[PDB]
Amino acid sequence: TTALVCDNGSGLVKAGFAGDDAPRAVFPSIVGRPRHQGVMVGMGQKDSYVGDEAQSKRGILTLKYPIEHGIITNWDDMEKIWHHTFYNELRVAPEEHPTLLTEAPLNPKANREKMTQIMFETFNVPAMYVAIQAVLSLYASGRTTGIVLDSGDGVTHNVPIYEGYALPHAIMRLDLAGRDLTDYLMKILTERGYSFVTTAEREIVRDIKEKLCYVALDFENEMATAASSSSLEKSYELPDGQVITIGNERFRCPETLFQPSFIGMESAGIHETTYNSIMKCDIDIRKDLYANNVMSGGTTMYPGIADRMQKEITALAPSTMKIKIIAPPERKYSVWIGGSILASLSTFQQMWITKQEYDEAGPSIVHRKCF
Amino acid sequence: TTALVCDNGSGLVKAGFAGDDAPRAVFPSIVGRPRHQGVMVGMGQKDSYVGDEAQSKRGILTLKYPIEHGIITNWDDMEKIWHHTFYNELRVAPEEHPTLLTEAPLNPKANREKMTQIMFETFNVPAMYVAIQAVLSLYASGRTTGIVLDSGDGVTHNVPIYEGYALPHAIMRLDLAGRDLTDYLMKILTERGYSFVTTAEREIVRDIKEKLCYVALDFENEMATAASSSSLEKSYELPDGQVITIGNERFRCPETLFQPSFIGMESAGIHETTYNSIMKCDIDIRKDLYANNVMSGGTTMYPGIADRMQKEITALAPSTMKIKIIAPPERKYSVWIGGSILASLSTFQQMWITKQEYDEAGPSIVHRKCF
């Protein structure tokens, strides 16, 4: 009846119905189980918690993320989350509506295949379709030409599109993402005597990151400033009422995106992979890509990250070239919005993979790209 | 003149001079104060006792450990212990010799900074240097490649090194250590009617642990054996002449290292953190690390812990991979020995941090790592 969109990205689940201007259900992709003691199976206890439930009671739960780097590692829990969505968050019967899923580019084929198996077995989804997150982001911007940097929690990727023609040869991917930034921050907080080691504690660190970190325009000078007595330090109140002070970690953390070597990776910085991706593309495209850098995803939510990238690319690119970073107020939901749009299109309709076809043709069908 | 080494780990102080094949002064990191009554200040009494003094008279003393989890919490007492060392145990003038200190990785920066302040203020140490315990352990083995599991009383840590190049991105740390094992044992002895609650009583439990506990190869089957009437029970004579019988606690205690959940921790077992650390490292290193697992520290002194770990890793690692656990007769002093070696090296000499530099550059210098 009404196609629905499920941006079940690696870390945060954003679901809703096509046509709506915002997701209806947004909650963490977390499954939590009782840590300290087994469950009183003959009494009023609960084996596991999902999303906000788990987060709320995380003090006694071990939290897991079914999805890592855009790859589903725990199918039992993944299934459970989808269940939770349909019956607790949206509270609709899944067999009544088409399902548009999202996926990071360059995954094991089995990832996609297994998802569709579930959707046509555990659930009885009429028809479904799996789309690339960056592509959808571009639809949300409404631009036909550009290059998209979608960087979520589990994965970062980069997809150039020119005049409505995807360029499936310069798609790049890093497993460097928000999850690693969280972990890194968590680690360096040790320097100030702040120890966070449990999974629940990790969750706290995530919150801190989201509220205090920002992207330094000039990292080295920012460090010098932080070294001197300054106003860069901020306070933060922990759940138990304690107050902590964050100093130069407020930018030493997000900086990692521009210098992956901080965590032992050979990857070029995101400003370099953007540039390089453009260099891999035909010289007659390059100019248009430079003026249309579209950022999306939660890790682009840091204050000043656009300005930093503006600067970084400017340096790498030709002096006569106009560099323009596009970074809409709603980057966080760009992909979901794109899905809403796409699902509502009249031409899109012909791409739905029906259960009928799945049953007839078989699993291989999920990799078709006729459009 | 002759550099000296002070492995002032969290729980036991091991000091001596570089070049010696063994520590010269080994005594507990304990400061004890009169419990039952205040001190007769105008008469021949003594306000506090240190190390073996305190241990010897512990029946009337409240014992404290200045260091917890590798972090100095009581500087006044810490200072006192260093005093005791230099003037009562080694009986040398500290201003005459370079001082090599040790430290667990990932501490609050202030820990290190404050120690050096003291060394260049309360004492007048010519020059000093703070090194990581696991690293030094590797020097003692004399191997250039391996991964070190140093597990003391207050802290456990794991540091991989490849061909003389440290890999400062896969350093892991747990606050799970000998102190917790002691506490746990102390707790479960309650089951047999053995109550130990005072600090002095804790000390007794420590001794028991060290003499009767061993690591079961197959914990579950070991439990079954213990359940049946068996020879696993051992006797132990308490200081006052009473005799106690220890049964399955002889392995339910050290087992905690392989199953941290026993004490409410989310930490993976030490065999899992070893494995995982290796997985975090580059695939072309992994093989060499597997054949060079170096264990050190007092908590690796349990009978059969190497065999247990051999088994555990074997299961986790590939079937074609050769797993080799290295566990020298002298694990207990590995770090100190490593310090002896390092301090005596001709290239090492250039890393000493002089008082001059401290005064000029300031406290920040203690985190340099030029080598």
Binding site: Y194, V197, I244 | E68, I71, P108
Partner: peptide, 7 residues
């Protein structure tokens, strides 16, 4: 420690 754990 200051936050998390005691030390």
């Amino acid at each position: 420690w200051x936050a998390x754990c005691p030390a």
